């Protein structure tokens, strides 16, 4: 099985292309941005929402949303978002996604496979907006950094996620809860 | 709340102090594969033992299980498994706990110092077995890519490990299926 090699593998994949970083970011050190990120935003949903959501399914499927790009590497959302691209992006993520875990055990097997064709719209959703959210708290790191070449991208990410807060109180509590500083620029837990 | 920040800065934390390395790892980079080898690890456990395990509780801890580095950054093992140093360490590990999550709603506030302080010994070793497969994985890579100072490493944890799978038959399955061939030489599934 060439699944944990594909684990490690991951930290190959470099986000951000063709934008200068202070610091370069990998698809694993993401991913685990965006499970830590998934698990508080589906805590503060259930409480506004009513509801408890199937944590294990969530936090796995955070956990492998982005493992198809060790085939197809990343390709950043200017790109992977124009019409020309879109569906044939799509079309290509499903095509790695059939032919990934090939020789592995059933238990392995199958429950990897759910987690990859996850049909759970929400807690696709509720990773969309992780992903989203991460996105911006990079994009806020590097603004802190002193990084002028992102301030137009923390712009954009930081209006389309004050958009989102109108439809979906979950994330206008997160944004009131950990969005309104950061990164911290005085650092007090550390003492 | 200071959570959100913690979790970025656990990216400033590095590994393998005091080593020669060519590619340095961070304990973002740590913590997202101990996630995705203790989940595999669960469900060779849970298939070989007869058993479900929880995996929300499983994934939160492996997910926050170094989250007390932020503090303490990472000691080595030979550094923090002294005599001298080894109880010290654990007691200054639970003050880090007792202080973490300041500002936060009680959602969150309870659940996470749930997932601090846990209790069930089960997902605790899971998660120690974990962190000890991705340690022998960070030294095969790094002898992979021609890293002389890691073979002794290697070769002290590949031994440790060798003996934890004679009593343990969910680690002997993990070894059988990953570690044999780990990292794979040729990349197919890239193609
Ligand atoms: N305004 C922008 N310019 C360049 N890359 C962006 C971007 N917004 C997001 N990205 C990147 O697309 C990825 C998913 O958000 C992100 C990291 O590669
Ligand atoms: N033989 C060894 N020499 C130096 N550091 C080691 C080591 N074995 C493990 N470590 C490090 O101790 C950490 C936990 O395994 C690991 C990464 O910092
Ligand atoms: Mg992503
Ligand atoms: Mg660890």
Do not use: M
């Amino acid at each position: 099985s060439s699944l944990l090699d594909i684990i490690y593998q991951l930290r190959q994949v470099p986000r951000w292309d063709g934008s200068f970083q202070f610091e370069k970011e990998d698809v694993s050190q993401h991913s685990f941005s965006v499970i830590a990120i998934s698990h508080i935003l589906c805590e503060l949903k259930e409480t506004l929402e009513g509801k408890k959501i199937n944590k294990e399914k969530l936090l796995l499927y955070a956990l492998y949303h982005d493992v198809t790009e060790v085939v197809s590497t990343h390709i950043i959302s200017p790109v992977k978002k124009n019409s020309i691209l879109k569906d044939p992006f799509n079309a290509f993520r499903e095509q790695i996604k059939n032919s990934l875990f090939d020789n592995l055990p059933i238990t392995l097997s199958d429950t990897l496979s759910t987690i990859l064709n996850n049909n759970d719209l929400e807690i696709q959703e509720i990773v969309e907006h992780a992903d989203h959210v991460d996105a911006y708290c990079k994009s806020c790191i590097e603004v802190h950094r002193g990084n002028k070449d992102f301030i137009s991208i923390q712009r954009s990410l930081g209006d389309k996620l004050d958009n989102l807060t109108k439809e979906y109180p979950y994330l206008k509590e997160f944004q009131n809860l950990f969005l309104k500083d950061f990164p911290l620029e005085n650092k007090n837990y550390r003492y």
